[PDB]
Amino acid sequence: SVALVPHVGMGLETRTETWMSSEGAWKHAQRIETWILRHPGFTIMAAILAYTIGTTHFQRALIFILLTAVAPSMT
Amino acid sequence: SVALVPHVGMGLETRTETWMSSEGAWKHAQRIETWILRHPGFTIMAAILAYTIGTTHFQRALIFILLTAVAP
Amino acid sequence: ALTQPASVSGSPGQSITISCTGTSSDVGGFNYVSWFQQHPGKAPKLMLYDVTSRPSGVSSRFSGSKSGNTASLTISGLQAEDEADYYCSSHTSRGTWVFGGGTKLTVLA
Amino acid sequence: MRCIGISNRDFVEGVSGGSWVDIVLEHGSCVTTMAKNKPTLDFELIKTEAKQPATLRKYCIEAKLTNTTTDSRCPTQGEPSLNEEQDKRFVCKHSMVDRGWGNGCGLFGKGGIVTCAMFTCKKNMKGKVVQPENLEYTIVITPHSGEEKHGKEIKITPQSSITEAELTGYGTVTMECSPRTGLDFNEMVLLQMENKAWLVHRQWFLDLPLPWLPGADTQGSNWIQKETLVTFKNPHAKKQDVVVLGSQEGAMHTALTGATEIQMSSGNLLFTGHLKCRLRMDKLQLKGMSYSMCTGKFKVVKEIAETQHGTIVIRVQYEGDGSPCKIPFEIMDLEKRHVLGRLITVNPIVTEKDSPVNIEAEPPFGDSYIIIGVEPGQLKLNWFKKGSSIGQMIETTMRGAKRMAILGDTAWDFGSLGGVFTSIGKALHQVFGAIYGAAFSGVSWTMKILIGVIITWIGMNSTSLSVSLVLVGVVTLYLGVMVQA
Amino acid sequence: DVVVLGSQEGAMHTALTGATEIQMSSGNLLFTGHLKCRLRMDKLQLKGM
Structure with a gap:
């Protein structure tokens, strides 16, 4: 719905506080961390996948983070 | 919000159709495609970054797709 | 509405055919073709539903068949008690029900 | 016959030494059972009923705020406190506000501020939990009798899952289920909205970001985490105000994408889930399987019909004598060499002479011929099967x-x-x-x-x-x- | 069977996270934004000089 397309970071921010500054900066961190703590098996599988495709440590961590971010967002 | 945490993929689906089955099947793809069309600069930057970071074409494409998907 | 002859008469012990005609949405498309007998001063009673089949407790004299947009009722061996009002009913496509104009059956003395 | 016309039709063949076959039933689907010398039966799960619902918690989706209060403190004097701050019906938040001489205070700097408003909820959704033993399963048992309340309805309970159905003329069929393993309602909750209901996972229901009450609360003042439904604003860091968020029922509907809609208007009616049941057919019989032939003629009253599963359904009428008698039905070839098909409706019988009878068969791919009756007046049909x-x-x-x-x-x-x-x-x-x-x-x-x-x-x-x-x-x-x- | 979805005002509020709160119930009033200005202090003079 409209909640999946919030008006975030479109270049209209000003000095005045916006509608959902404080906790709107973080509903990401909370919902992704809750998803991680609720479905650890997917996090483990993403860890093996990152170790497999990734050749250097940096790209391994990058792939792992992107997969972990997609997992709740794609839902 | 609740719309960010849908009751999807929890292993309870049966033969009868779910609530938002047909409409919700491709809505994420539609919004991602619209965001890609309306924000081309980030897509180009993500393609460049995926080209630089990876070592093989497969992970170039993989990083591109992941970066594109996460951004919305 | 449903179009059918107002009155049909025949000799007793004979075979007669009466037809009910509607449109494609109710008669020509569905098998919801049923016939009801209305005695004078008495409640209607079904003599035939699903014209290919017959109800229980109804004599096999009554037979129904559908030819395209027209549904026909055939009675073999006309008798005195058959003189009653007969109605053709169809469940239309739109979910409602349509009835015929009512037919009076006359048996010659 | 009740399963004729449903695209979710399944066939099970053969029996074991104990004449027992495991079968699985789903809502909206039904299965057809037959064996070498057993009548053909149809099994359909039509209704799931839960008698005793228990309210787990109530999630508020529209709220209203009144009695807004505000208290301010000069900088370096801590944050102000109000007696509604403990009163947890009032949602409160502490922010920081510029204070100075123009604000009536003798110092300049970051001044404390607190605002509280009474939290009142207009309408809410209920989450009902049901113990597994409070489930009722309804099964219809209709045999392929060929008749135009035809089947028998039986009820399955978790505490008493052992039951049998007395079929008129077929004897008795024993059907024992095991609902403990079908769906685990111990981890399920029946979410109920104003007029629609969903069956969602209990754990996913508990962690919803909404204000909630204990399931037994009635007065309506024990709301937890009301901050997810109200917001505070500091547009210029000079005064904070609290406003309510909008109705979340649309957001909740969007949040139930993978949920399954159920019915809770006239009881806990569930039309979802499966049921793995154990079927025993030791004591089944065939109606009048000893009668002789129908030597008379026949006429088709409703012609060949093709289902989605390659079978044929025929209603035919008998006009000869000897009723009741057996119907000569068999799928032969043109020159009458080899049997090509089998009868889904095993042993077609004419119960009454003027009563039409429905017959089922499964023709092979290609040319197929239906043989009705015997010479003279034998009927031969010419249906062709499309496929391979x-x-x-x-x-x-x-x-x-x-x-x-x-x-x-x-x-x-x-x-x-x-x-x-x-x-x-x-x-x-x-x-x-x-x-x-x-x-x-x-x-x-x-x-x-x-x-x-x-x-x-x-x-x-x-x-x-x-x-x-x-x-x-x-x-x-x-x-x-x-x-x- | 067709059923209408719920109220989207809460979803809209969750979608307006980055928008700026403005009041226009009684006339369109805004309390945000910036204004570049060229200040000319040519004719100013010290009071009580």
Whole structure:
């Protein structure tokens, strides 16, 4: 719905506080961390996948983070 | 919000159709495609970054797709 | 509405055919073709539903068949008690029900 | 006959030594059973009923705020406190506000501020939990009698899952179920809105970001985490105000994408889920299986009909004498050499001379001929079957694969006869499904296709490990494409 | 069967996270934004000089 397309970071921010500054900066961190703590098996599988495709440590961590971010967002 | 945490993929689906089955099947793809069309600069930057970071074409494409998907 | 002859008469012990005609949405498309007998001063009673089949407790004299947009009722061996009002009913496509104009059956003395 | 016309029709063949066959029933679907010398029966799960619902918690979706209060403090004097701050009906927040001489205070700096407003909820949604023993299962048992309340309705309870149905003329059929393993309502909750209801996972229901009450609360003042439904603003860091968020019922509806809608208007009516039941057909009989032939003629009253499953349904009428008598029905070829088909409605019988009878048959692919009666006046029909044996086999294998995907380990019990191979397959797929559920719990389908692509590529580029990986990848891709959500 | 979805005002509020709160119930009033200005202090003079 409209909640999946919030008006975030479109270049209209000003000095005045916006509608959902404080906790709107973080509903990401909370919902992704809750998803991680609720479905650890997917996090483990993403860890093996990152170790497999990734050749250097940096790209391994990058792939792992992107997969972990997609997992709740794609839902 | 609740719309960010849908009751999807929890292993309870049966033969009868779910609530938002047909409409919700491709809505994420539609919004991602619209965001890609309306924000081309980030897509180009993500393609460049995926080209630089990876070592093989497969992970170039993989990083591109992941970066594109996460951004919305 | 449903179009059918107002009155049909025949000799007793004979075979007669009466037809009910509607449109494609109710008669020509569905098998919801049923016939009801209305005695004078008495409640209607079904003599035939699903014209290919017959109800229980109804004599096999009554037979129904559908030819395209027209549904026909055939009675073999006309008798005195058959003189009653007969109605053709169809469940239309739109979910409602349509009835015929009512037919009076006359048996010659 | 009640299963005629439903695209979710399934067939089970053969019986074991004990005349027992495991079968599985789903809402909206039904199965047809037949054996060598047993009547053909139809099994359909029509109703799931829960008698005793228990309210777990109430989630508020519209709220109103009144009695807004504000208290301010000069800088370096801590934060102000109000007696409604403990009163947890009043949501409160502390911010910081510029203070100075123009604000009536002798110092300049970051001044404390606090605002509280009474939290009143207009309407809310209820989450009802039901113990497994309070479930009622309704099963209709209609045999292929050929008749134009035809079947028998039986009820299954978790505490008493042993039952049998007395079929008029067929004897008695014993059907014992095991609802403890069908759906685990111990981890399920029946979410109920103003007029619509959904069956969602209990754990996903508990952690919803809404104000909530204990299920037994009645007065309505024990709301937890009201901050998720109200917001505070500091547009210029000079005064904070609190306003309510909008109605979340649309947001909640968007949040139930993968939920299954149920009915809770006139009781806990559930039209979802499956049921693995144990069928015993020791004491079934055939109506009048000793009568002789119908030597008379016949006439078709309703012509050939093709279902979605390759079978034919015929209503025919008898006009000869000797009723009741057996109906001569058999699928022969043109020159009458070899039997080509089999009768789904085993032993067609004429109960009454003027009563039409419905007959079912499964013709082979290609030219098929229906033989009715005997000379003179024998009827021969000319229906042709569109398809091929390979096409039927491949459609069967997709149906079996999708059934496996959507039933998990219970799919091996659809037509299990107690064989050792069936048990081994059930155990292997059970452990594999346990691993899969512990792996891909709460993940979207498109992500499943992405994962399947990843492991397929890995297996292609990396030999036993390679083949195992590509098999896992293709299975995951099939699961993702076949799953609705 | 067709059923109407719920109220989207809460979803809209969750979608307006980055928007700026403005009041226009009684006339369009805004309390945000910036204004570049060229200040000319040519004719100013010290009071009580």
